[PDB]
From a paper:
Starch phosphorylase (EC 2.4.1.1, α-d-glucosyl transferase; SP) catalyzes the reversible conversion of starch and inorganic phosphate into glucose-1-phosphate (Glc-1-P), playing an important role in starch metabolism in plants. S. tuberosum phosphorylase is the first starch phosphorylase discovered3−5 and has served as a model SP for biochemical studies of plant phosphorylases. The most significant structural difference between the Pho1 and Pho2 forms is a 78-residue-long peptide insertion in the middle of Pho1, termed the L78 segment. The stPho1ΔL78 structure reveals that activation of the enzyme occurs through the proteolytic degradation of the L78 segment and the association of the two remaining protein segments to form the active enzyme.
In the crystal structure of the stPho1ΔL78-β-CD complex, one β-CD molecule was found in each one of the three molecules of stPho1ΔL78 crystallographic trimer with B factors around 170 Å2. The β-CD molecule binds at a totally different location from the glycogen storage binding site in rmGPb. The β-CD binding site (named glucan binding site thereafter) is situated on the surface of the protein molecule approximately 20 Å from the catalytic site. It is a shallow cavity composed of three loops. The stPho1 glucan binding site is at the entrance of a channel leading to the active site and β-CD is bound at the one edge of this channel encapsulating the side chain of Phe848 where the other part of β-CD packs against the side chain of Tyr853. There, the glucose residues of β-CD, G2, G3, and G4 are involved in five hydrogen bonds with the main chain atoms of Gly847, Phe848, and Gly849 and the side chain of Glu650. Furthermore, G2–G6 are involved in 55 van der Waals interactions with stPho1ΔL78 residues. The binding of β-CD seems to obstruct the entrance to the channel that leads to the active site. Hence, the strong inhibition displayed by β-CD for stPho1 could be attributed to this. In the HvPho1 structure, the binding of maltotetraose triggers a conformational change of a loop between Thr422 and Ala427 from an open to a more closed conformation, but such a conformational change is not observed in the stPho1ΔL78 structure upon binding of β-CD and the corresponding loop remains in the open conformation.
Numbering used by the authors:
A (entry chain A), B (entry chain A): 23 to 446, 511 to 916
The structure:
């Protein structure tokens, strides 16, 4: 029962006896580490309690495998879920600090990139909160993806520093090490078994990150792998000879696996590295899982119970090698026969798809994979032949020519010969998505429309064969992190007006706000909370962008990966149009025509994506002029927040008035940031695409700003443009010409506008229809202007967004996964 | 006041809440870490108490700088000095372990190599025990020198694994980081000051190893440097392009500084690396020292008080760069004028010499040093010119031709032009030893004869100039580690018969054993203690060498660096002679002629020293035959203990009956292992050389086995051999021929014997006089045989060795350094 007193003693204790700094003074960094270690003490108690119960009881356990987890900062959520925010705040008060200052010392854990990773993270919170026996498995990336800086020249990339001192959270398990093999050869023994000898041998060591549940003792693990080699592999002979690099070579090759996330793969070395990362994740994870299965089993070890005890979820095609690897282990190591192993495999593994287009599903060079994982490629070839025989059986050999088409689309190997075709240099590839739909008992999309697109467009034939496999699991975000903790002002309101705090768990109770949406008292509280959140942001923007902005203005935010298809370019074009129209007006007219706005951009551009970077540069330049133009004042500000991450999101989302989700219609599978915006009472402007659809439905069409073409239209409108029919709006041309004038920039921008012109060519002819949708967009923004002027209306919309968000709780998503795929049951930790 | 109960709770606490292993079970490795962390809690309390007092009081502080510290295991000495051996033993009992088993888990800290490093370590124990305000400074080497393995083929080297899990002792100071610069250029500012810009920039981070004193709270620091670079220096551009090595390049170049000790320097890269290691040590240390001086000074900062507050001891020529660097800092950074800086420097720095020969004193390429440390080379040139003017002043310019000789020998630069010689391609070098004798206020040898050799032979001219500089400080070893803890059986005896335990501190009380040396009760206790110690060794030899040996036999040990000049070859030749003579005898005769012996060799050979390795191979082969020859049985065993280190020494020395110190007379400056042997009642066979002289004196000539030629003789006996006069003894020829017969080996050994033959040539003509001394040696060993047969006599000798060892306490040595060089006074920590 930790109180302010015990926590104070705890923090002091750690500062002295588990130091990572000099004894003098109690600065912020020291205070953070000591605080974090105090928190971790509690986490470990419950982690052990959970671990023990799970071990003794031997229920079925689920394992979520992902190449990214976007964990963010742990501190406030850890104390939050533990219900010690008050005690820790008081203890820090006693030590001459405040909670918010200490929490800001913590770096975001750079273990992921985007929604894929954040989904996994939200899931871990839900899994723990709901008492579900499940773990995450990932790689412990040293330098993350990259830290973004915004210079005069725009985006620059620099390696992450999050481990420079180290993580106070993680728990290294020195006794939890597993061998990983690469390269080498396969050979048959006199016993008839396959033996994969030789190659490179490395180790994978476990680091546990405890994940505590909300108002429970259930604390699960995010177990991360770090790759290394023994000290003995250091070549003294080389080093003493002066060949210092050559000496370090083995450990360098081993460790780089865990250096950065999504390493550049234009190079052969890059591709090899990627494949190693995947294999490392799959193999280390599986070995650890199987070890745990073997333990718990005691004397009797019934392998046919494996799927009744183990579920493995593959977050995207990255953990695909789980299928071949689990086969390899069950056959070569455990001695099972093909059918037994294949049964167990399928009943264990499941797949989640996040992609709309069939291109963008992972493929590998056959030669490359076969060189690196020879034994795996054997097992893949086998699995593929079994499929070829099952196709021929089912469809028969009466129609032909179509059967050939059904093989060409469904086969796991691409440009391969076939065993015995009745029938009468293109490169050979392995299709990982196909492998996933074959080796797994379940395939799910992340939104209702998306899941339908999986069954109808991408995996049509497989859907025909095995309808029972296909599912949907609409995405979610945790209300702990994304309401309760990131937005205390609002949380207080919800607790008041729903009459309880139960909503953090029973989030459907948000719907009870509907009936009060027009109440003037609630409206005032609501407007005050939103204003409060914006203050925190104003200082943030000051210190990070250099620009002073006012509250009392619409916060219009677009925070996501910089890509042409996300159409940051559309938003900023809208901003520049509005700017031009200002300017060509008197002061009095400006105030009557446009409401005050702070337009906030955020997100990272792929370093080698020339256009993406150009766009970031454009935005910063637009801001440069607008923000210093004295005729604009505090009517319009444009800022680009550097280094968008979970922490930034936790700051901006609570303070957001409008959020932009304006990707070319279709394209997006789901999206999650929109769900968090909605939860915080943000109003969304976006296309009919991804989760926008389900959100718009649940919040109400009147409380969402829809614009632009739709999924059905796109193909036709591209077939416009080509043929040479498309006519641009005059206002769009006006923006382009205003840019070319030099208005914002010594900087060129000709190659930027270039992408929007023409009717053919790669990287040209406005593929993403910024021009086409530009009209409906700026028109829609005028409507936003109107709504914002009517604060009674605007606030009602805000309230209804929060009231209709409850189904996007990740608790709902995980209840679904738990019951309909993994088949696991809650477990109480008294 | 920690008791068994609190310590038990402490160990349990750490096992759970500061884990580095999985929760399951309480194996040895986990138990060790938990135990060590419990110990460290106490160490930190007292480390802080000491730190605080030293800070407030602002006395003079001494800093011992060394490229090696041979710290060994910390556990038993830490609890020993804390006086908690009993409580920790009981606590571990309660947890289902025993102390000795836990302690054996700890790896020796691989931070040094030999006596040089061990001297430093002993000093740190004394310094703390005696309450002297002083720290050590060193490098935190990752892989030490190398771990020795003994194979069928002899010695193999493999990198040390001591940090593979990490040290439970060290305390990282993340806020204690100092910039180190390499390369770059110097340039003068408009203010007239020198500016060293550009080059490579790296960081040096402090790791504290607490060193507790015996029966005191004084806990000082061994502060180790680890070199690194910020995360930002990681080149993402390179890495994502596939150039994974090139990306890692900056951090690789920075970190390799702290990889291994004494890296091979045949290569240019090796030499550069060495120089970086030295500079890193000097610069990081000095910066930290100066920082501490600046602090403590408060507002008033009087640089002329620097030497009254700071002493810097240079252990050998490795920390030579302290002189140039301290000048650089005081001039360029602190703005002092040449004379002020030079005054302060000299009054701060002092030098310790460990070498007999003038060759073997460090020299550097001028071009190389000037490229790496340009600003330093400037300051060296200045210091040298000042010397050239002081020489000319003092000796005048009347004699000439001799004055030219006095410049040639004393100048710091070699093959350099002179400023204005009155007077009327050899490579340019920097003489580091010369620099040390100029920049320091004190120069000391490590033994009385050695110190005289410094003044007379090596630094004759400097002695003429500055007699006042030269001193002696005869070496010592700590009685804590090397009696009290490594030998409990004996410790109990000493406490009994001296009537108190005070001797651990007041070690002169060992002399009181003299009067009881012939007492039959003491003799029995003594013989029992020695036998007891040998049991521990028998199991050790079983598990490490594979050979079963009996107690009841003379333990005849030679443990030290394998080198021709140490003459392991002599010892083993003696063993092979004795073996041959056996064999050519009946069983009954063998027992009458030779006493049972276990002959134990230990030590490491330089990897590229062809002969040294051949010797190790020889010894192992001799053992192979002898130990399996059924006609020899337990009359003779020859073992080579692998991986000789502090722990091995702590095991073998207490169990030793005879110890061999048989280097070619002269050559050795001191030696310390002999002092530890003597302390444990070992009888020494050795030449009149190094510390053998002072030991032999103090223990009594009758209780030492002297043999072989002497320092005066050697030159004459080399001038024999050359000229072609030397006649070999027939028994020596008999050994050589017995080897050539193939007796021991398929292995060749022709190139081994080769070194002993001829009268001229590098690597030939028995330079180290194994042949010449062979007669007196085997004769002397026959005397050993005789003495061993007379157990009353033998035991008396043993007792008198311990009784006459007390002056070789490192407490005596440090009292001397403290009063006569550093001028520091004890400080009480209540
Ligand atoms: O400088 C840009 C890139 O130039 C490429 O170099 C030339 C090629 O060598 C040359 O052969 C020819 O290209 C051919 C291709 O070989 C064909 O495959 C292509 O076929 C179809 C196809 O269905 C498809 O490409 C489609 O194009 C769409 C595309 O489907 C959309 O996704 C979108 O493209 C985005 C893309 O999604 C996004 O990732 C981003 O891509 C950047 C990447 O850094 C990189 O892929 C690319 O590389 C260079 C490289 O030098 C050569 O590959 O750079 C882009 C930066 O823009 O942005 C793009 C933006 O478009 O939109 C396209 C719209 O076309 O339709 C094509 C039919 O055209 O047919 C082309 C025929 O031109 O020309 C290349 C250009 O000189
Ligand atoms: O294979 C052994 C080494 O061979 C060397 O290669 C040949 C040379 O190229 C060639 O020029 C000639 O060598 C010359 C030298 O150039 C002269 O300097 C030398 O001068 C004097 C000098 O006063 C001194 O060397 C002295 O020799 C003593 C020496 O003082 C003692 O210390 C001792 O030497 C030990 C040594 O201390 C120890 O470290 C260990 O050394 C090994 C090292 O790995 C390495 O130095 C050496 O390298 C090779 C290398 O290929 C060439 O340098 O290998 C040795 C392994 O033995 O052991 C030695 C053991 O002796 O004892 C010597 C006894 O001579 O006296 C010489 C006068 O001779 O004069 C020689 C003339 O031969 O021949 C070299 C041999 O082919």
């Amino acid at each position: 029962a930790p109180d302010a007193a015990s926590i104070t003693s705890s923090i002091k204790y750690h500062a002295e006896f588990t130091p990572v700094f000099s004894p003098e003074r109690f600065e912020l960094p020291k205070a953070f580490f000591a605080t974090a270690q105090s928190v971790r003490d509690s986490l470990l108690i419950n982690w052990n309690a959970t671990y023990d119960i799970y071990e003794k009881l031997n229920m079925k356990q689920a394992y979520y495998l992902s190449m990214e987890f976007l964990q963010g900062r742990a501190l406030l959520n850890a104390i939050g879920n533990l219900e010690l925010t008050g005690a820790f705040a008081e203890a820090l008060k006693n030590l001459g600090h405040n909670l918010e200052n200490v929490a800001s010392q913590e770096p975001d854990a750079a273990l992921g990139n985007g929604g894929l990773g954040r989904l996994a993270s939200c899931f871990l919170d839900s899994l723990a909160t709901l008492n579900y026996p499940a773990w995450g498995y990932g790689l412990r990336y040293k330098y993350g993806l990259f830290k973004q800086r915004i210079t005069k020249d725009g985006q620059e990339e620099v390696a992450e520093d999050w481990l420079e001192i180290g993580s106070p959270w993680e728990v290294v398990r020195n006794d939890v090490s597993y061998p990983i093999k690469f390269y080498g050869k396969v050979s048959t023994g006199s016993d008839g078994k396959r033996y994969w000898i030789g190659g490179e041998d490395i180790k994978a060591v476990a680091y546990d990150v405890p994940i505590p549940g909300y108002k429970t003792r259930t604390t699960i693990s995010l177990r991360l792998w770090s790759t290394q080699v023994p000290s003995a592999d250091f070549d003294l002979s080389a080093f003493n000879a002066g060949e210092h690099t050559k000496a370090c070579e083995a450990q360098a090759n081993a460790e780089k696996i865990c250096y950065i996330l999504y390493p550049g793969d234009e190079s052969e070395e890059g591709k090899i590295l990627r494949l190693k990362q995947q294999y490392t994740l799959c193999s280390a994870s599986l070995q650890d899982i199987i070890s745990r299965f073997e333990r718990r089993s005691g004397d009797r070890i019934k392998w046919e119970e494996f799927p009744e005890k183990v579920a493995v979820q593959m977050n995207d095609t990255h953990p695909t090698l789980c299928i071949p690897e689990l086969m390899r282990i069950l056959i070569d190591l455990k001695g099972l026969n093909w059918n037994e192993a294949w049964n167990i495999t399928q009943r264990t593994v499941a797949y989640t798809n996040h992609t709309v287009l069939p291109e963008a599903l992972e493929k590998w060079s056959y030669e490359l994979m076969q060189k690196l994982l020879p034994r795996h490629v054997e097992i893949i070839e086998a699995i593929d032949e079994e499929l070829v025989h099952e196709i021929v059986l089912k469809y028969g050999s009466m129609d032909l020519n179509k059967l050939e088409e059904k093989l060409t689309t469904m086969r796991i190997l691409e440009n391969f010969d076939l065993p015995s075709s009745v029938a009468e240099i293109p490169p050979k590839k392995v299709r990982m998505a196909n492998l996933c739909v074959v080796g797994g008992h379940a395939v799910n999309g992340v939104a209702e429309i998306h899941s339908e697109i999986v069954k109808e467009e991408v995996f049509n034939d497989f859907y025909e064969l095995w309808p029972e496999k296909f599912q949907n699991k609409t995405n979610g975000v945790t209300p702990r992190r994304w309401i309760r903790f990131c937005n205390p002002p609002l949380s207080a309101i919800i607790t008041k007006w729903t009459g309880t705090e139960d909503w953090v768990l029973k989030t459907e109770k948000l719907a009870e706000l509907q009936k009060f949406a027009d109440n003037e008292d609630l409206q005032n509280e609501w407007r005050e909370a939103k204003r409060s959140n914006k203050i925190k942001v104003v200082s943030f923007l000051k210190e990070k962008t250099g620009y002073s902005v006012v509250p009392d203005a619409m916060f219009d935010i677009q925070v996501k990966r910089i890509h042409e298809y996300k159409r940051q370019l559309l938003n900023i074009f809208g901003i520049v149009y509005r700017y031009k129209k200002m300017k060509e007006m008197t002061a009095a007219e400006r105030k009557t025509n446009f409401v005050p706005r702070v337009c906030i951009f955020g997100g990272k551009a792929f370093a080698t994506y020339v256009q993406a970077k150009r766009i970031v540069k454009f935005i910063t330049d637009v801001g440069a002029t607008i923000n210093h133009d004295p005729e604009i004042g505090d009517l319009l500000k444009v800022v680009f927040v550097p280094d968008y991450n979970v922490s930034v999101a936790e700051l901006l989302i609570p303070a957001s008035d409008l959020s932009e989700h304006i990707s070319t219609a279709g394209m997006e599978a789901s999206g999650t940031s929109n769900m968090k915006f909605a939860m915080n009472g943000c109003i969304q402007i976006g296309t009919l695409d991804g989760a926008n659809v389900e959100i718009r439905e649940e919040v109400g069409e009147e409380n969402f700003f829809l614009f632009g073409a739709q999924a059905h239209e796109i193909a036709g409108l591209r077939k416009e443009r080509a043929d040479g029919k498309f006519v641009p709006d005059e206002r769009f041309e006006e923006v382009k010409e205003f840019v070319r004038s030099g208005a914002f920039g010594s900087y060129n921008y000709d190659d930027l506008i270039g992408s929007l012109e023409g009717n053919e060519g790669f990287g040209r002819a406005d593929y993403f229809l910024v021009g086409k949708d530009f009209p409906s967009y700026i028109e829609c923004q005028e409507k936003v202007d109107e709504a914002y002027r009517d604060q009674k209306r605007w606030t009602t919309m805000s309230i209804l967004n929060t009231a209709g968000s409850y189904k996007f709780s990740s608790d709902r998503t995980i209840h679904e996964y738990a019951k309909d795929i993994w088949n696991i049951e809650a477990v109480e930790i008294a």
